[model samples]
Target: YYPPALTGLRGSHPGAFEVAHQMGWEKKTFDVDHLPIEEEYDLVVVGGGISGLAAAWFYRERHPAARILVIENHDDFGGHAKRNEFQAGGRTILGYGGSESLQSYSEDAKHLLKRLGVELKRFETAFDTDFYPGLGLSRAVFFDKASFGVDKLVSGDPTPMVADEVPRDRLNARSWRAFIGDFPLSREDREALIALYESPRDYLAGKSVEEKETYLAKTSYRDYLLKNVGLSETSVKYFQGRSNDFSALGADALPAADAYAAGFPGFDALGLPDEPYIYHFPDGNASLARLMVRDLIPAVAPGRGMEDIVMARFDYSKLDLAGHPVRLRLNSTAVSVRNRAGGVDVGYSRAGRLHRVRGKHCVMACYNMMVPYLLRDLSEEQAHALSQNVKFPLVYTKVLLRNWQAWKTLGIHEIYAPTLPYSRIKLDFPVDLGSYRHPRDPRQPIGVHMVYVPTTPNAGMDARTQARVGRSKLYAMSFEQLEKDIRDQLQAMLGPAGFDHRRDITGITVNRWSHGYSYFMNTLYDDEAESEALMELARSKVGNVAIANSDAAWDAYAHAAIDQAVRAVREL
Candidate 1:
């Protein structure tokens, strides 16, 4: 029994769960009495999100008569994949959603979907309707564009057409084994391309001051882009503003390779998609919670089939939760897990009541950060390995909005920036009110914006430092400051028509997520041996406990969560 201070980071960091806990947020309420543990079930799955629910459903299929229990910390089951709908101006709009699309999976995902009786067509059709244009760019071009005269030199190209090509011949004079490229390579050309790819930074290491300026330093993608990419300093402001919305990268933190991959087409040599890779409902990836609930508890699910329920607009509250229908105990946070004589015992709190449950088998499906707290029996070396390898940065901020009058005046629908002051920030045009079909009396449009500066040391301290330099004004800053920064960037990009910060603005709210997503960084996939070990330590044995959530694996996303759930039940 440790003090609440040592319970977890959320308890340690004052700012972490303050807002959500204080707001009496519906999802944060933990009323266990409403969901008392019935007869000791055959399997108890912790987490009611996609992962947990999937686990329960899977267990039922394997052991049809097995009684299962699912515990969730939030009032609703969807983890971050939940959605919120706003009805206004005669339209039903998804005010907030996630994972624009899903792709590239292992056999596990396929089997789980089959068990759930979900047709791939449903997912495929949903993706087709919500396509966000791809933002792709070429790496070679991006890098070459930054070099001096390199852009013009490579413009036509099988060979350098101008006298200035390799003027000093420093790089060209080198041996042919160094360079690599697809073009017809004289032995020299091949050497140069190889050198460039093999040692991109080092290849430019020996340039003279003048030569460096012409072919290296300022010639690098970072340098050349400063001169080109077309937008004026002010116009670039919008691009920088929204840059961090999707990633934790600061304006300058992104590597040249990443920029090229994101901006160029067919650059997915590593197979990662361009952007908007995955999305979730308003509650973040928890939207899948609603779907899983319906599947496991038919009575609570809509009267229609799974396909109809997906597209249907039924009220979530109308569903009934009788006869052990996917029990979701919200606000009930699990504090610790330990191995007992025959199984595992999980200690958790609801309101102020501390209770314990015995389970047959358990899964530690929460985030990696919470692993140590829940798995108290691991050796020092084991705990260290898990902690050091599993990491994520805290990139936090909120979405704000003004009235449609401001958007109408701006005329601009989307804005982009590639430079600083406002780098790592992005703002979308006023969402179409009619799309959601909400009532017109409000006439206000939500200004969807993102701020990506992270507070994690793992993401790179230098970048984090720069992000912090711009932080004082944003963090705990006045609402006026937040509004001013957002409106100012919009006005700068759209001119007088863009927005009127002072008059057009009507309301605002701030959404901050302290521990957002796991940072994959450069860690190798096979290197996750510690993850496997920790999971072994956390498994339950009462034929009742299971874990589900993105944190089950190092990667955090909807697919991971769903996959975790399915695997847990299969293990049972």
Candidate 2:
């Protein structure tokens, strides 16, 4: 029940990783379940992610008494809004293993957040804004000896990069030649780094702003460094993998415009205002997911306020109880969905036993590409279209520390090192909820989150091929390998601060999503309409069966997932 799979840093929910391998994507041959006939649900959801819960919540609102059954292949619900709670010395702290924030919600969307018990008004006061600078926390870039010639960590200032209007003078003044003058950058190479931060107009000497913009969007940062500026691949490593944002490619390989827009390598002359980013919860959107679950099943976790959610102990057993209209059945995999006498016949596998459920309506709110495999009756055209959306995979690993006194002495909150397996490592976001306090004291246990998008972007590989390659890379590594990565990197970068990874570290949890972020519209893969048309073609309600999820919108947003669920329920 508690601490499922007590050993090894967990990956995506227990047993969720190998589910894809069990499903014969391009392969298939199975028998009907001979075990037993399960309950007849008014609606059966194939996915128990945020979208799945949203579908159930929206549908149940319309038909309050409807018996809804949610089948998920993972542990707990919430999908990628993963939550991990760690306890040491009688105190507890929560960490986000997956999706972290409510990115870019409009005033119109406040109701949406509120609907899930996220009081937007209190977000400013929900947690203490432990401002990085106020705490003497400067961002730093770590240079591994393999990438750069030396094992060095240079101070990264103008660190309060809060807004796009962040003092350009401060940023430009901290240029490579001015500050890192001693680095072994060849004369021209040194200037190239400067050009990236200060005089990028030199690179576009003869081009119009429009032409320059177009060139930036299409051109890779590496190529920009090599062609526009004269820097060797060796020197580019300094700025490489720094911006693995929407685009997966390492900084050295990612597009120049995307990188620039993301505020990497320092934009030379663009004066875009800093867009606001609010990370509201201590454990990111795990509270958002918990809130939605609380709304759906009031008895799941008896709690109030987003702050209390971290400590709320959810009863997995209660999820599928008899009296509840909406039941969440976890550790259950839906094998197939087919047309049946009364409605949709859903065949599922729990443990080695097979079971079947009859439902008036079915929502395939699971992974987009895997939808075709689940509904064997889907037209080949539809199936192929569904597979077009190859998800962008990402791995988020969190290492729990007995104390972060070492980091406090080091005076840094985040570090960037592309050559390492884990691309970025940073102190937990500035958060201090009521019961969940930020680990400000050096003696307080802390959780360091690491983000690694396994696949590099804009490669020649198509979306499907690239996803396969990325997933393979993720699975090949074990928890031990991940532990070594954390231990090695932390000791190497912060060891001088009296950090002893072997002694100070308590635990680690790796949240792997081989089918992680959904693919949004990008020229790298399709024409603009291709995404829209694919979504349209991929969604065709058959009998009582329908499709929902972020994939339906071809978006990777929580709102899109909810929107799809709303539409999915309406479609039924």
Candidate 3:
């Protein structure tokens, strides 16, 4: 499956069969007819994201003889962690549009990697120095270009303005006065801006007026530059105006404090610097999936020459199915689920056949939006709580260009501009568009641009409507819109150096994730009411139904999902 941001790069990777052959790994096939549905299994896991897969693997370790069934709604598992591939001009690229990294938190995750025999080098530790650049001291300072000492102000060196030379009060007043003097604003606009800083809100009330004004005045990097730091109105409009659409804030709303916190030093409690992040991978974590699939069905897993199997590009649709070993059905869409006497009756359509699978246990590990449809028995309050408490915003776009002649002229390997018309854009090496090849003279250039858009319940429409629309709607954006957005933002940021919209553009694909990332509602934090209600429903033992996913732990991340899966399986 292709996420909105990485559709163009999905097909770049070699298929399982091809990769295995290249690596000289052994290959084997199993007969599906040997498998039987006559006997009941001990456990059934639903959803096929990393969490579900990890849980299934873990459960097998604890109870090898326990019968298990894993049901997925997509053609392949991995859920949001899945990648997309793209092929153009005999080149391949892999678009990582889903969960790009796994955080380090629980020991179970670290232990799981070791158990799977995955190379330690393949797994990078989260929160390491690589992830948090410069110890999170990276910072940016805005300057009033019109000020006499603009160069000194924006130089970013605080040594000259040390404590003794520049007292706190003097510095604060000077900064605010310089900002107001630089940006001429109408009375009403200035009042409104001042009110935002002076408001007696809990977060701002304790701050000094000068400090509050600086924050309010510079709520948005764009606003600070245009209205306060004396950047041209046209420049401000180009850079800052459109950025609001990319953020969670309403058009007229002030930028939240958290946005600034992301880049400012000492913002995060961990004390890490805010430098451009670097991604780490060992076989890109795809090896972990291979290990899981192999262990799940050892009979079908290639023996000694496993290296060959690893290199082969196998058709995902034509995998071997053998023995009463575990069965994974893809391209199957589950319609509804109901609690039965001894287990949960899962109704799904696969290969045009409407089948009912009876499972002793069921795990709802998909996005929260799908919960209401599958578990219809939830009380109004309970359903609302689930729907409201969990949310995901849409972000990121992946664009591919066949020819690099135009981009090469710019001499710009990477573009980092806070004043760009778009939210964020970057240029990097193109190892895989849909296929892997050498970076030099091997393939086309891949551009991954990120756009932040709010999908939170409180941002706009009511919770019910948001859930009803679902993630599918967001993924259905037209290519024309994608191309237009990419071109518009690129030209604005790079000017003539950026790729020509009229030329050098061969193909464009868009992946729009409606329910992309999960966010917890304010009430869900420090409030046990919702959790208690959910626990009550879970305790009823409606069949063997069990709830899993990031929502199960009220945190949105891969590790949390895995933890929930383990807990659900253990309870069974």
Candidate 4:
């Protein structure tokens, strides 16, 4: 049974987290000492995500004959690098359920991808970057009546997709005024927004450039708008949800410096340099993961290169067969990891039975917060530091449509909703490789990517607190509740263009990441020095157990995960 093809309630699926919550949240202890050791390995990794897989690969590189065991709680591997596959109208469509694309890569990760036969140049032709803009489809804003007084779709987004890619020179005063003119806001609020986007008057007039930079670094974007830019609360609400895709926090908590870096509307006059950001597979980084798994266990799938691995259906049953040098054990949750005399002993539960394993070395590549509960040998300070890593909560929902006729009719490629739970909704990236063909014709089936950051908007709380609240809210939301929302929102947004949700939508997969992006210290709320010191202590080697994962570095990029893996492997 291939998990990618399953549509209902994917990403932190039902059966995956119960055991984890029992150990991490409830602090339940397991008496697995009475259980017999089932296996022995050279290396035992606590996760099967990019970091854990990379850790296993790196360890094997150093010790070629080393036998390794990777335990994962999910039915499928590739923790956040999740894949979504659908059969819509006789066409097999794929989308990224979690990690989207390869951003800037470290040298270690670069060589790793190259070793796996991934050619960066191939993406130049595979990615049709201008597919939407060439069809006269641009970015638009969807104002829901609950907050904006009326439901209206307004075109001409000043800061387009990956805002840094769109240069500031492309937007002028006239376009800014015309774009804001269509807003369903009071005349004063509309005029305030236009002035915020168009006028070059420096709000921080008294300070020098360096001084302005310092002020912006320590200030929140919401505070900047209210205190420095001097805009009404209603005008500020327009930007509250803008940072969801990046930081999963509202502007109220995000630093103004970050907003300036992300090329937000008010920061246009700041004259900051633009930053460009990727070659992506249809299933995003899941291709990288599939390639890694194939290299680790060739019997899992056929073909070697990155292209064929995209559509290659892995035989999940073959993942943990006996006699394999490197076995990936799925549906196994590690409840306890203790340092023994010779090695480490890991106690995990799988299929209602508790099993124990021994390894010469262990890498705690799972969630940092969970590490405190699993590895009981940590000091109070170390446990406290690890538990502080409260991940940001967000959801990536993929919708398969019968066709793109409605999108073409609306002439909009992306829609930004300031009021809805799902703030950003856009068409899937146009990527074609191997035998997988992207939907070029509007008549062909296409996947729609929707992002929902469950954090409370303008809650006047710290980023971590907001994330904690969002995690609780996200876990409580069922698939049926989310499905109803998906249908209702699509109808409200696309009904005018002859889009019938029941008829046009074919499949929906909600990748609910309650513990999503790795936590980064908020410049406005946290002391950078103290946060870094604590993070370093938390990730430091504990006896034979080494920490890995993007959480270890407090950086939410794929390369960071790989880098941490290399470090963790070296620690042993």
Q: Give the candidate number with the greatest TM-score.
A: 4
Query: What is candidate 3's TM-score against the reference?
Result: 0.63
lDDT of 3 by residue, 1-572 (tens): 22212344231121211221222223222112222334345566666677677767777778787666676765556665554455665545545454544433457766776666544332223113221111122112222223222211121112111002122222223232333333334444444433333432234445665675456433544444444434444334223323223233221232323333333211222212222122323123343454566567555345422233233343343232635557666555555566657776666545544556666667666655455555645666555555554454454555566555443453333232323223434343222211233234314555443453433222344333343343334444444555566776555433444456556555554444445555443221224475556534532323466667766665666677777777766666
| Model 4 TM-score relative to the real fold | 0.96
Per-model RMSD to reference: 12.7, 3.3, 11.4, 2.0
Q: Highest lDDT among the candidates is held by which one?
A: 4
The residue-by-residue lDDT of candidate 4 on 143-251, one tens digit each, is 9988888899987676654533223443321377888888889999989988876675678876777888888889999999999888898888888787888788888
Which window of ten consecutive residues has the lowest lDDT sum in model 1? 136-145
How far does residue 307 in candidate 3 sit from its true spot (Å)? Answer: 9.7
Evaluated at residue 501, the lDDT of candidate 1 is 56
- Tens-digit lDDT string for candidate 1 (1-572): 11111211121133333323332233343323334343354555655556666677667767777656665564444544444433333333343333323443657677765555545444333332121111211011111112221211111111111111112221122232311243222445444344433434322334454553333211223322334332233222212323354445433444434444345211123222222222222233333455566666665545433344433443434332435534445556666566656566666666656666656666656554454545556666645544433333333223334454433333222233333223323233122211122212224654343343433222334442433433432346454564565556545543444455555443333332334454443221223465466554443322333445566554566677667667666655
TM-score-superior candidate, 3 or 4: 4
Provide the TM-score for each candidate, comma-separated.
0.60, 0.90, 0.63, 0.96
lDDT scores in order: 0.41, 0.71, 0.45, 0.86
Deviation in Å, model 2, residue 107 alpha carbon: 8.8
> By lDDT, is 1 or 2 better?
2
Pairs that clash in candidate 4: none
Model 4 global lDDT (CA atoms, 0 to 1): 0.86
